[PDB]
Every structure is written in C-alpha cells, then in structure tokens.
Design a protein around this ligand. Structure first.
Ligand SMILES: CN(Cc1cnc2nc(N)nc(N)c2n1)c1ccc(C(=O)N[C@@H](CCC(=O)O)C(=O)O)cc1
Ligand SMILES: CN(Cc1cnc2nc(N)nc(N)c2n1)c1ccc(C(=O)N[C@@H](CCC(=O)O)C(=O)O)cc1
Ligand SMILES: [Ca+2]
Ligand SMILES: [Cl-]
Ligand SMILES: [Cl-]
Lengths: 159, 159
C-alpha cells in the first residue's frame, strides 16, 4: 500500500522558500521511526533539502531531470517509482507538494504531524476530505527544552 | 580571558526554557568551531536543551540544585566555575540569561549571532554599551534551503 508522511503547519503549509522555522527533533524521530526499512519516494527539491540519502531506507527520487547522485535511484514517473519499490508491504511518500498530489489518490494512510506554527507558505499539503479518512491515532505534545513548537502526531486510514 | 557566545533574535531576545523557533545548522557550526577544545560554562536550562555533554569541551554547569549527571562538572558559584576551568587562554560562557548577566562584567569578548527572527520573549541578552566594545568582525548570511533565517556573526572586544 502507499502512505504519505508529512509535517504540516497551520493551513496545511509544508514548505517555504527557505528551511522551515522550527527545531523539532521529536518530530524527526517520529519520521525516522515510521520510514525506517521502507522505500521512500521524494521529489528533487526535498532531496536537495535533506542533503544526503536517508540511512537504512531505499531512497527513490522522482524527477524529470537527470540523476546527480549514484547513491539513490532516479525515476521519471509515478509508475516507475512504484516498480522500483519491489514487493514491500508499504511505500512511504515523503514530499513535496507536487509529489503528494500525484500519490494522494492511491494512498491508503496518512502519517501527519500538525505543528502549531503560523507561516506564509510556498507549498501546501493537498486538501483532503476529512469524511474520507479515519483518525486511528493521535498524540499531542507541547514545545519543550528541545522542541520549539507544540505538535500532534496523527495517523489516518482511508475509509 | 572570558568570552560570552550567544544567538540573539530581534531586540536581543534569547531562549528561556523552550527551544528557539529557528533551524540554523550553519549557526551551530559556528558555535562548535568557536567552543571546541575550550571549557564551556552554562546554566541548567541550557544544559537540558543540549541534552548531553558537548564533545571535545569541558562542560561546567552553574546551578544551585544538584548534579544529576557525572559526565560534567556541577558548580554552585561563579568563582567555582572559573576555578574549574584551570588555566586556559579562553573560557566560553554559553548561557542562559542569568549566566550571561553574571559573567558580562568579567568578559573581554563577545561572539554574537544576530538572527532576523521576531520571537516573543521575557529574556534578553544583557544590555552592552557597544562604546565599551569595539565591533571587530561582522559577516552576514542569507537564509537558504537548510537555514531558516538570515543571520549575522559579530565579534566585539572590550575597550
Ligand atoms: C528536510 N527534510 C524533509 C522532511 C522533514 N520532516 C518531515 N517530517 C514529517 N513528518 N514528514 C516528512 N515528509 C518530513 N520531511 C528532512 C531533513 C532531515 C531529515 C533527517 O535528518 N532525518 C533523520 C532523523 C533525524 C537525525 O538523524 O538528525 C532520519 O534518519 O530520518 C529528514 C527529513
Ligand atoms: C541549545 N543549545 C544552546 C545554544 C545553541 N546555539 C548557540 N549559538 C550560539 N551562537 N551561542 C550559544 N551560546 C548557543 N547555545 C545547543 C544545542 C545543541 C548544540 C549542539 O549540538 N552542538 C554540536 C554541533 C551540532 C551537532 O553536531 O549536533 C557541537 O558540537 O557544538 C549546541 C548548543
Ligand atoms: Ca478514531
Ligand atoms: Cl520535492
Ligand atoms: Cl540556563
């Protein structure tokens, strides 16, 4: 099955011109826990943002342009992206905006992190119909010594 | 000689307890380059935000309450903190607020990072009359894919 995993600020903002203005090691820990040992599909801008391949995951980059790193797999279509995953129970799509838009229709589950940050965004997570999804897990946490903002983890399954 | 190193938001706002709302790996690199191989003095809140002893530095915690951890040095007074440093060319004071207030009188240099972020806060870096200080180095950087805000490194020497 295909799952989308994203960190959304207020109004579903997911990206800005520069790095997001938050320091959330706990959110990254959740991201790692939910993607480890699974293929991850991302767009080129997300790839460039991370800076290196994610350890212990098969990194797949969906892009019309040519491959710059021998450490990951470059694909040119959703179909190719999928085929590169092989036979695994779950494929994780990690962004950005355009990639989420192309995979939403095929997605069965969403792993969302809602962050209480008001920012002017560049890209936003596609509008989802809350009547179409069932929340099966939610957990709220306040900002603390290491995390700059409050956040809530949520997992939704398609009804 | 004693030096204070701090990251300030607009209006000189500094962290109190929760992590600051910015992601500046280039700023932490600056922090590391300037404190490596030197003793660092910090208060209890800063210690909690770091979460572990900084490698390659002698970690001294100035606090009234008790030494949780054995990997660092716990002192109850300014005099004791200085003594624990031994005889080195430069002692780095890394915050927070009350710690900067206690050492400013004794400081000969300031390594400051001015960040273009408006943050609401109670705490401010102590008032320094820059005419008692000579700005000796200044280098501005714009925000990018990995750094959430613009920042300017500055070094001042006590005249
Ligand atoms: C810019 N970026 C994209 C990013 C960030 N947070 C997200 N958070 C969620 N929930 N979902 C995403 N798709 C997401 N994507 C990043 C940047 C760094 C790391 C990262 O360092 N991850 C380490 C975990 C943190 C660490 O080792 O420092 C990992 O092993 O996943 C991940 C994603
Ligand atoms: C919360 N905190 C206090 C902190 C942060 N930035 C500062 N920045 C400046 N300029 N001055 C300070 N006093 C300062 N203090 C921290 C948190 C983490 C690390 C840290 O991880 N430092 C690693 C470098 C980054 C990494 O490897 O994780 C190091 O080796 O110094 C440092 C300070
Ligand atoms: Ca439910
Ligand atoms: Cl992307
Ligand atoms: Cl402190």
């Amino acid at each position: 099955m295909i799952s989308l995993i994203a960190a959304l600020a207020v109004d579903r903002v997911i990206g800005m011109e520069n790095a997001m203005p938050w320091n959330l090691p706990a959110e990254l820990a959740w991201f790692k826990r939910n993607t480890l040992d699974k293929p991850v599909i991302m767009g080129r801008h997300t790839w460039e943002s991370i800076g290196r391949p994610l350890p212990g995951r098969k990194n797949i980059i969906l892009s019309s342009q040519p491959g710059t790193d021998d450490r990951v797999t470059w694909v040119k279509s959703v179909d190719e992206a999928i085929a590169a995953c092989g036979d695994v129970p779950e494929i994780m799509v990690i962004g950005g905006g355009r990639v989420y838009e192309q995979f939403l229709p095929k997605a069965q589950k969403l792993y969302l992190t809602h962050i209480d940050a008001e920012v002017e965004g560049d890209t936003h997570f596609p509008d989802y119909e809350p009547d179409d999804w069932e929340s099966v897990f939610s957990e709220f946490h306040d900002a603390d010594a290491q995390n700059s903002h409050s956040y809530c983890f949520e997992i939704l399954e398609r009804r």
